[PDB]
Amino acid sequence: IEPVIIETRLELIGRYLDHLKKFENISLDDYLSSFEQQLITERLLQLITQAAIDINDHILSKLKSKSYTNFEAFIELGKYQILTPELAKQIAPSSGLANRLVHEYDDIDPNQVFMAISFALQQYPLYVRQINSYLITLEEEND
Amino acid sequence: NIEPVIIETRLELIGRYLDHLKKFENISLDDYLSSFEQQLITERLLQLITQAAIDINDHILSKLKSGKSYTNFEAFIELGKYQILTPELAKQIAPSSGLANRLVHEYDDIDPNQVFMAISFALQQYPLYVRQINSYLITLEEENDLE
């Protein structure tokens, strides 16, 4: 496992969350009225989830050199206790959110993106902390 | 016929996205590079415009190409060969398929300097795309009515 590959993406997730947090108090009616605010939060959520999918793929490629869907990849990290199983279960559906936001499914419901903001702001800081704690362990073993 | 309705809805969306993108036509590079939020808005607008056009092109060519395959870049060039787009526009606008692939993260990392230039390219080219597809839409409706 290459720490800098993982840490670069974790830092990006943290940056994107920092920007997404600027939206955490916007009312739904103002959100639905502002296409540009929908665009910003949709792209932030896409970038966050795609960075996580990339992190998970890198980690699993070094451990289980088996193939997982993006949803299962979160679950598998839970089995390795790299994520907690509870976080892995909660956050795995953000893989479907990523697909939704690149138009792999049908239209985007802004009401559901609005609610997803608060769950991303809860779950992904924990994802970052858990992956960071794993990376730090690997680094402190090398030392 | 379902193809005209499909094209017309997507053209209406492209027109709306272009209206929002036009707000950024006069932004300076330094202003753009210093505002992550303006980068996000323009990146997603470009993603939505190009994806809608890719959808249109797929529906146009499925009627004309009897199962023959094509990439999203190639679809734009095929429209030029069919004189649905002018060849000049077709070759100018085909690389927007590569922009779209980068914006949905098929590969690579996003260079904001390239996205900055794509704002101008899209504001020049996609209004012409809309006009020319709209002219084809009329021909299609006439052909369906004539058959």
Ligand SMILES: *P(=O)(O)OC[C@H]1O[C@@H](n2cnc3c(N)ncnc32)[C@H](O)[C@@H]1OP(=O)(O)OC[C@H]1O[C@@H](n2cnc3c(N)ncnc32)[C@H](O)[C@@H]1O
């Ligand atoms: P894709 O087909 O990957 O996602 C669709 C749906 O299936 C869920 N899923 C994928 N793979 C699995 C496995 N292996 N097990 C169980 N479930 C799986 C995936 O999590 C996704 O779930 P959804 O709850 O439909 O969506 C995830 C997430 O997206 C937001 N959401 C939902 N519907 C939306 C609309 N219409 N607009 C905008 N956002 C939407 C919610 O945040 C939801 O939790």
Ligand SMILES: *P(=O)(O)OC[C@H]1O[C@@H](n2cnc3c(N)ncnc32)[C@H](O)[C@@H]1OP(=O)(O)OC[C@H]1O[C@@H](n2cnc3c(N)ncnc32)[C@H](O)[C@@H]1O
């Ligand atoms: P992807 O693999 O989709 O595209 C790669 C590259 O190849 C071009 N291409 C695809 N198919 C063909 C055919 N049949 N013939 C000739 N060329 C083809 C495709 O247009 C793309 O060109 P690029 O110049 O790499 O990119 C197109 C477009 O994207 C923006 N761009 C470029 N680099 C970017 C970064 N780093 N970030 C964000 N956007 C970027 C530019 O607007 C460029 O014009």
